[PDB]
Design an enzyme around this catalytic site. Sequence first.
Site, short mmCIF file in Angstrom:
data_model
loop_
_atom_site.label_atom_id
_atom_site.label_comp_id
_atom_site.label_asym_id
_atom_site.label_seq_id
_atom_site.Cartn_x
_atom_site.Cartn_y
_atom_site.Cartn_z
N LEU A 22 178.80 57.37 141.37
CA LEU A 22 179.47 58.22 140.37
C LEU A 22 179.62 59.65 140.92
O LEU A 22 178.66 60.18 141.49
CB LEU A 22 178.64 58.27 139.08
CG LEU A 22 178.39 56.96 138.32
CD1 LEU A 22 177.59 57.27 137.06
CD2 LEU A 22 179.70 56.27 137.96
N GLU A 30 176.49 57.30 127.99
CA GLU A 30 177.70 56.65 128.52
C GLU A 30 177.32 55.30 129.16
O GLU A 30 178.00 54.28 128.93
CB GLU A 30 178.42 57.58 129.52
CG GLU A 30 179.95 57.39 129.61
CD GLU A 30 180.38 56.17 130.42
OE1 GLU A 30 181.37 55.52 130.01
OE2 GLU A 30 179.73 55.86 131.45
#
Length: 186
Positions: A22, A30
Amino acid sequence: VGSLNCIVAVSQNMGIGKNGDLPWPPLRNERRYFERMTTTSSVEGKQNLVIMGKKTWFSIPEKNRPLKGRINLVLSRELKEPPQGAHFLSRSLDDALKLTEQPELANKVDMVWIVGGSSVYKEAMNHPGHLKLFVTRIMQDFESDTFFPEIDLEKYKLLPEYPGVLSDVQEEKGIKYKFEVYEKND
Ligand SMILES: CN(Cc1cnc2nc(N)nc(N)c2n1)c1ccc(C(=O)N[C@@H](CCC(=O)O)C(=O)O)cc1
């Protein structure tokens, strides 16, 4: 085998990966959203199939691999064997979908979720049929080296206030984000 779905989190600059991980720091709520969406099957008794590239696999903390309560499948042409913890390896999405029509999986799989990265999203989006995209819009730029394909708004429809998905802007670690859902059917 039920519906094909993509789930992705993408930065303002279309970024989805940096060094195969990420671009942004971990976002706990999330990730919990991700877990709920990918785990919940729509057919009683069946599990969803999660399909991912090798970098996505490696980026998942090893204590959480394979993703519990889902059938995990890794797509790769470079790997000789499924990575440690995974039991399914395919060369391409079409190959993976072919696998779901086989005995081991045929009556075990409901939804298919593509969970990254770039080229496997592209494969899914190039596949004819009904496809939903669950897109988390990370509302800032992050340095990225891999990117989500553009969403063809001549073909996809945005689905405002999609049921069961929070419509208001979210925030974690000072980073705002929002959930959007799109679909095509062709
Ligand atoms: C880096 N990576 C890929 C990742 C992360 N967030 C995403 N978020 C969205 N919306 N879509 C994705 N494809 C996505 N992919 C990860 C990292 C960790 C876990 C993870 O540990 N998930 C566990 C634990 C979830 C949790 O602790 O909340 C699960 O059960 O799904 C999943 C994906």
